[PDB]
Nucleic acid binder design. Sequence first.
DNA 1: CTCTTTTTTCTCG
DNA 2: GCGAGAAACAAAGA
Length: 268
Amino acid sequence: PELPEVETVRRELEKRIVGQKIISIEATYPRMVLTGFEQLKKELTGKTIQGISRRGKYLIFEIGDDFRLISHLRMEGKYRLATLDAPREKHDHLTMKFADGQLIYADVRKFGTWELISTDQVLPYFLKKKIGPEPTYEDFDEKLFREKLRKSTKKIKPYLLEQTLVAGLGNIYVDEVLWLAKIHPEKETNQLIESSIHLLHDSIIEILQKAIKLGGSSIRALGSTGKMQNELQVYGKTGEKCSRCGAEIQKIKVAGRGTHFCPVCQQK
DNA sequence: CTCTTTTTTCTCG
DNA sequence: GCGAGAAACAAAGA
Ligand SMILES: O=c1[nH]c(S)nc2[nH]cnc12
């Protein structure tokens, strides 16, 4: 998932598991609990979920006053709420059992992670990761954005993907953002002019906020009812029309990543 | 059969 | 510092 999908999951969970006491925690893949599964099980068992937050693509379970469970779903981690008698599925790895149901984490590629962090260590956790601002008008300052772009010779798509200029873009929304902003994904950021940086800034916020409103893009669990996939202009649409007078979407490889763009729209 | 393709972090030169 | 490439892993497609 990317930020909009994680936010969609956050909202669904907030409605349903806040107030729930954790009765037990079980793992078939304890290795994805980076801070130690036995430690996590000992600390959280019997605690009540106070809330669910998000920072960039990270889910943050607030559990008791003094602990946070920081979860990253990476490529295709999925949460679902199931009855206590639900059968195990092949790629289920963890479950929190409540009195009237359970929260199960599944992840085909086993990339997703769990980390138990004390409450006063959450802000330092994200500072250490150098996560950039949330993609909102209030948090995403264009002035600082502009300065960082000026000082770098990185290509704009990989730099955006680093999460340091702004949080939340993955491969899908970065291709969508760059099409909307009419910027080439290999454009060197110090070549971007002010007006272009302004459109990029606004487009990032606009695309991500639109995606959130539409419940995320559901491609191929919680977060499965999204509609943003119907609004994608370029991602995964190789050879199809940009509706720009016959122009077709091209796919290239940029810093190891599949990259969908419309050449005529996105010249350097 | 092989090869490529689909978030973050790590190694190498 | 940088970029390139690969690793973690599983499954699907050419
Ligand atoms: O009108 C447009 N034409 C082209 S080619 N690319 C775009 N990106 C956002 N709007 C446009």
